[PDB]
Design a protein around this ligand. Structure first.
Ligand SMILES: Cc1cc2nc3c(=O)[nH]c(=O)nc-3n(C[C@H](O)[C@H](O)[C@H](O)COP(=O)(O)OP(=O)(O)OC[C@H]3O[C@@H](n4cnc5c(N)ncnc54)[C@H](O)[C@@H]3O)c2cc1C
Ligand SMILES: Cc1cc2nc3c(=O)[nH]c(=O)nc-3n(C[C@H](O)[C@H](O)[C@H](O)COP(=O)(O)OP(=O)(O)OC[C@H]3O[C@@H](n4cnc5c(N)ncnc54)[C@H](O)[C@@H]3O)c2cc1C
Ligand SMILES: O=c1ccn([C@@H]2O[C@H](COP(=O)(O)OP(=O)(O)O[C@H]3O[C@H](CO)[C@H](O)[C@H](O)[C@H]3O)[C@@H](O)[C@H]2O)c(=O)[nH]1
Ligand SMILES: O=c1ccn([C@@H]2O[C@H](COP(=O)(O)OP(=O)(O)O[C@H]3O[C@H](CO)[C@H](O)[C@H](O)[C@H]3O)[C@@H](O)[C@H]2O)c(=O)[nH]1
Lengths: 391, 391
């Protein structure tokens, strides 16, 4: 008679997805342990008192996916709005259409370019590097949008977001942005897209609503694992915290980036007239500004006040929560050591590793949930139900 | 034993809506008489042979409404895509964000304007006229977007579309375009919007699919009414053709505008990278160019060919099909005479008048359908079912 059938460290999208699936589809008790006073991780949102506008506390989250299984899954806990995310870029005191497209091109070069003419222009400016090569951020970016556009809209932004030389940064970072030769300025290229109709918190609460799931807020796993695991020794553990932290940075500290936010309620109805405005120039400390009233245009808010959030990027310290993995040459090598260690902990202590922090991966919400569904289907579910080893 | 319970002249959205409602909700036989070889009026679409791309034969039709009753009604015959219509404007060799918004403003004035700064700028340029006044197109346009924007994006376009002095044109024409101070470049401001998933023709066919509805193509009402009406003398008539034509232009010919189209299949994958590109300058004969592949981005078409359509505007003649009512001072006065005549025909011959052509009104698809549902509920249905007079 064990107390719990499963331990889940972290109540983020990965953890809650794991906890929900195991509790619902396998009929087993799951104890979720969250270090923070709230669930949902960075996806936790809150309604600003003066306006009632939902505020993405730890960075603006926009859900999008081309995976129908994920889409059908997340729809069990929330409805999604018709919202389609668009981003504008501030450069030299001018707002630019974004990302790569005819809008961006025509504005920056002072005249209209046909889809054929635009491809021709960029082909010239993407001379010294071809996409088939290009291992880093700088090489891949230039080979996609050309160098003049790279200088104005990538170099400065990347400098503030990473403070790391773009030749050391992964090429997968810049390919998150769609490269188009039309007037399509949708910031994502996924089939399904939208915002949680009743907020992220309500969404996250419905995933951990099952009575077979217990969430212990303000509880650190490393403090209470020596006491909990004996209570249920057969129960595996899903860890979604920082991978390097799990081993107390034994082989070294992985490269992370963290974010600081300035939330402000302005006495005006509209600050920038759009959801997210990227600041690509270096004469400004923050990377971008969010205006959350434009996240939900279907909702009607007061037109005498607005809520904005300036986003700042710096290196993650000891007491900081990690937001972005940097994955440089040294970081991936250090990651390789921890992957071997994690592979050992799985075989010796039934401890799994998943999530943005758990795998040192640049994971979006849908990619995290998909990764969780993968871990469930192929690892946890065969184990808890059919006794199949975790390896 | 009468042959038909109702006569409907014209198989446009108004006529088919009337025919469908009467046949389905009242269980009565409706004879629809269409002068054209096809149904649907200007909404009739066809698949271009080489590409399979749906082509709006008589002008690009984009459905949009804020009326849920209309929305729920039209959904009985077709599904709608997630499409949101956006228009760009060509001016001095540069593509501009459109309509009135921060995108348009910032591009045209060379720097970014905050929602507050933009309102300030336009307030200065909209000096000599206030919207509370402003009876014509020119006065209302300037009072909404200022004069400099009026010169560049309205004056030239209006000149080509109407060839009529903007001080003689209605103010309701320019207010069809949303005036915003954000980056929202959606060309419509309605709750519901989209394109028929399986084309307009399939949509139109499903409305006239009922076996109690008979459609006689290539049949002019004026030729066969003397023979048909005696066959069913109690059956009312819904006329949706040109109002002035019904009385053989007895008091004069109303002012109309007609359109000519040049459909072309280019050996390139993309001509302009967007659905509709407005040409506001006078150095070009056509008002705008449509590219129908961008109407349905969810559909995948061949990337070696594309279908475009240049739109030309001129005065409607005798043999021309009327597209736009002009409604000048003289036209509305002439319309007043025909309204009295139409009111007499209703009382003397049970003849109703509805639709874009039937009422000399600038009607969109949803406004036409809503107008048809209104005529049904308050006039036809009480008449055919409860014997209530048509007046
Ligand atoms: C600024 C920003 C914007 C983003 N925007 C988008 C977007 O628009 N669209 C999109 O799809 N994705 C977006 N993302 C990414 C997204 O937030 C992540 O994919 C998401 O958090 C996935 O959940 P995860 O659980 O894998 O990581 P996290 O949700 O951060 O989950 C980790 C949790 O583990 C807990 N934890 C860690 N260590 C311990 C411990 N020792 N004990 C107990 N608990 C612990 C933490 O408290 C945390 O709650 C954005 C991210 C950022 C930073
Ligand atoms: C270029 C263009 C673009 C447009 N785009 C949009 C858009 O994007 N969104 C939107 O909502 N609306 C749009 N509209 C408007 C829309 O097409 C009309 O609202 C629509 O046609 C409504 O139908 P209606 O029956 O009132 O007029 P029509 O559909 O033109 O119906 C009239 C019919 O009566 C028939 N007829 C006339 N006389 C006779 C006769 N004597 N005997 C027999 N039959 C006769 C004609 O053959 C015709 O088929 C657009 C219009 C144009 C011209
Ligand atoms: O104007 C830009 C935009 C992006 N980049 C480069 O592209 C990389 C990735 O760009 P992202 O937009 O993915 O940066 P974020 O991860 O911070 O974006 C986050 O915030 C966005 C909100 O607009 C999105 O929702 C996105 O999904 C979410 O991960 C960046 O590191 C940066 O190096 C630039 O250089 N300049
Ligand atoms: O760039 C512009 C656009 C509009 N106008 C003025 O605004 C009036 C109305 O503009 P519309 O866009 O409504 O012109 P249309 O009626 O031709 O538009 C038609 O084609 C459009 C397709 O993009 C829409 O779908 C629209 O609903 C449909 O009625 C015009 O007469 C014109 O005088 C301009 O001056 N300049």
């Amino acid at each position: 008679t064990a107390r719990f059938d499963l331990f889940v460290v972290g109540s983020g999208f990965f953890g809650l997805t794991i906890a929900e699936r195991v509790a619902t589809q396998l009929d087993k008790r799951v104890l979720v342990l969250e270090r923070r006073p709230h669930i949902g991780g960075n996806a936790y949102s809150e309604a600003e008192p003066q306006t009632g506008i939902e505020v993405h506390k730890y960075g603006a989250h926009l859900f999008h996916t081309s995976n129908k299984r994920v889409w059908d899954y997340v729809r069990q806990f929330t409805d999604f709005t018709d919202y389609r995310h668009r981003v504008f870029a501030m450069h030299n005191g001018q707002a630019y259409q974004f990302p790569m497209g005819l809008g961006l091109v025509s504005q920056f070069f002072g005249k209209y370019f046909t889809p054929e003419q635009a491809r021709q222009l960029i082909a010239e400016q993407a001379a010294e590097i071809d996409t088939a090569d290009a291992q880093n951020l700088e090489e891949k970016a230039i080979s996609l949008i050309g160098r003049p556009l790279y200088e104005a809209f990538v170099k400065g932004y990347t400098a503030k977001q990473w403070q790391t030389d773009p030749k050391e940064l992964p090429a997968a970072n810049i390919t998150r942005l769609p490269v188009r030769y039309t007037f399509d300025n949708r910031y994502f290229s996924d089939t399904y897209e939208g915002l949680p109709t009743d907020g992220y918190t309500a969404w996250l609460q419905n995933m951990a609503a099952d009575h077979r799931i217990e969430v212990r807020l303000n509880t650190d796993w490393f403090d209470v694992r020596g006491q909990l695991r004996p209570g249920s020794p057969a129960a595996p553990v899903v860890y979604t915290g920082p991978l390097d932290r799990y081993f107390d940075y034994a082989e070294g500290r992985l490269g992370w980036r963290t974010l600081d936010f300035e939330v402000e309620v302005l006495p005006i109805g509209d600050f920038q007239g759009t959801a997210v405005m990227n600041y690509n120039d270096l004469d400004v400390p923050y990377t971008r500004i969010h205006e959350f009233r434009h996240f939900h245009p279907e909702r009607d808010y007061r037109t005498d006040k607005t809520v904005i959030m300036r986003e700042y990027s710096r290196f993650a310290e000891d007491d900081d929560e990690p937001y972005y993995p940097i994955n440089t040459e040294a970081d991936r090598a250090l990651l390789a050591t921890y992957r071997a260690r994690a592979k050992s902990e799985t075989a010796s202590s039934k401890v799994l590793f998943g999530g943005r922090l758990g795998t040192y991966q640049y994971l979006d919400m849908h990619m995290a949930i998909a990764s969780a569904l993968n871990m469930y289907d192929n690892v946890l579910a065969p184990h808890l139900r059919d006794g199949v080893p975790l390896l």
